[PDB]
Write a protein that binds this ligand. Structure first.
Ligand SMILES: *[C@@H]1O[C@H](CO[C@@H]2O[C@@H](C)[C@@H](O)[C@@H](O)[C@@H]2O)[C@@H](O[C@@H]2O[C@H](CO)[C@@H](O)[C@H](O)[C@H]2NC(C)=O)[C@H](O)[C@H]1NC(C)=O
Ligand SMILES: O=c1ccn([C@@H]2O[C@H](COP(=O)(O)OP(=O)(O)O)[C@@H](O)[C@H]2O)c(=O)[nH]1
Ligand SMILES: *[C@@H]1O[C@H](CO)[C@@H](O)[C@H](O)[C@H]1NC(C)=O
Ligand code: NA
Length: 369
């Protein structure tokens, strides 16, 4: 009933039609799949793959010759994970899923179910209990990095994702952008703004499942170069993964970073400017990369949204905001798709499944050409 073609072109009438449908009593009562449904469905992997329409064969030789690794950190919403995995799944790639140690038993079993169906999807060999804004969020990605670097020698790039991400490019287009990177990494990395300093000048501790400022003053970072500011999300070469897992100075930086607030938002940005890190850029601010100029992740921050022809980096959210981040509505997609980033965040089947559906369809159609 929803014309996804009109949605992707940005037709206000079709968008309004989605907005109205979302408001109905009938929509909010719609039947949802449970983690138990997934435990059930994945007993028969052949039928699960067929039914859910995973892609079982690589689409081009170009893609076959360019394997990609993914690290996916999740804790809930099994249906969104299955949609995300299906959208990015290729037989030649690798997928490590980190399930939060605190997640529900049934969710963890459902993730293991899905993973058991694929030789190249698997659960991280070590799980962290992930506390919001803490080191354990970084630690989750490092765990996956460790597994992936050991399991195969031939993948080119690692991309980290969360459970509520969605691709806005096909595998083929991602591979081509990565080939265009020429062994360089790509992620946000900008001069540290002075209002983010309280996050690492002080020691933070977990008090009652919650990361809190102790007020204790930290030693300076063990680094010649500056700290840089960025995001949790990155696109990095295998050689970078290797270096970071084994280099001693990087290790000291990480150990120093453990008791900071949101270390994920400076750790990667910072390492990317250390000389000798594979794929790194010089620390000169001429090479700084903003979130819009990097390709890693398109994200809309509430306080930045506005009139793009008036200086706003992107137009207002059409979904809803959660902690200042736009969760995308169908009205966001048109503009989003003209951007160069590989993935976007956040989506949510509970808020606007029509956004995901149209994006999902468009990408599958586009790929099968
Ligand atoms: C596993 O699933 C099958 C199919 O159930 C359907 O799909 C599921 C994912 C979920 O959405 C269910 O609500 C759907 O009905 C189950 O087989 C069904 O069993 C019910 C109850 O006896 C029956 O009414 C249906 O006709 C059956 N459908 C089919 C296709 O056989 C099955 O019971 C589930 N098994 C377990 C162990 O939970
Ligand atoms: O209890 C939690 C909460 C968060 N996460 C993960 O941490 C990452 C970041 O979560 P989110 O994007 O919601 O944090 P925020 O958007 O508020 O910065 C995601 O991969 C989540 O799956 C987690 O593993 N356990
Ligand atoms: C959806 O809209 C497009 C573009 O306006 C139109 O060409 C197409 O026929 C429509 N699809 C259906 C099945 O109604
Ligand atoms: Na597996």
């Amino acid at each position: 009933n929803v014309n996804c073609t009109k949605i992707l072109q940005g037709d206000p009438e079709e968008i309004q039609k989605v907005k109205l449908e979302i408001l109905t009593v009938q929509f909010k009562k719609r039947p949802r799949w449970t983690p138990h449904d997934y435990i059930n469905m994945t007993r028969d992997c052949a039928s699960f793959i067929r039914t859910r329409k995973y892609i079982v064969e690589p689409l081009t030789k170009e893609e076959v010759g360019f394997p990609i690794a993914y690290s996916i950190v999740v804790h809930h919403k099994i249906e969104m994970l299955d949609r995300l995995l299906r959208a990015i799944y290729m037989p030649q790639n690798f997928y490590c899923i980190h399930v939060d140690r605190k997640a529900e038993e049934s969710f963890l079993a459902a993730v293991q179910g899905i993973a058991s169906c694929f030789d190249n999807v698997f659960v991280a060999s070590q799980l962290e209990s992930v506390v919001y804004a803490s080191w354990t969020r970084v630690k989750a990605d490092l765990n996956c990095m460790k597994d992936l670097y050991r399991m195969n020698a031939n993948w080119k790039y690692l991309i980290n994702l969360s459970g509520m991400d969605f691709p806005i490019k096909t595998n083929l287009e991602i591979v081509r952008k990565l080939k265009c990177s020429t062994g360089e990494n790509n992620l946000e990395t900008e001069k540290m703004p002075p209002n983010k300093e309280e996050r690492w000048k002080k020691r933070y501790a977990v008090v009652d499942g919650k990361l809190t400022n102790t007020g204790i003053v930290k030693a300076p970072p063990p680094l010649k170069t500056p700290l840089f500011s960025g995001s949790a999300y990155f696109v990095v070469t295998r050689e970078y993964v290797g270096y970071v897992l084994e280099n001693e100075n990087i290790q000291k930086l990480m150990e120093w970073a453990q008791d900071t607030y949101s270390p994920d938002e400076f750790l990667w940005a910072t390492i990317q400017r250390i000389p000798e890190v594979p794929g790194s850029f010089p620390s000169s601010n001429k090479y700084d990369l903003s979130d819009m100029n990097a390709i890693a992740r398109f994200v809309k921050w509430q306080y930045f949204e506005g009139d793009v022809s008036n200086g706003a980096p992107y137009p207002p959210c059409s979904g809803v905001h959660v902690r200042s981040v736009c969760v995308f509505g169908a009205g966001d997609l048109s503009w989003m798709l003209r951007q160069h980033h590989l993935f976007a965040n956040k989506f949510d089947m509970d808020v606007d499944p029509f956004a995901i559906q149209c994006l999902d369809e468009h990408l599958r159609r586009k790929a099968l050409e």
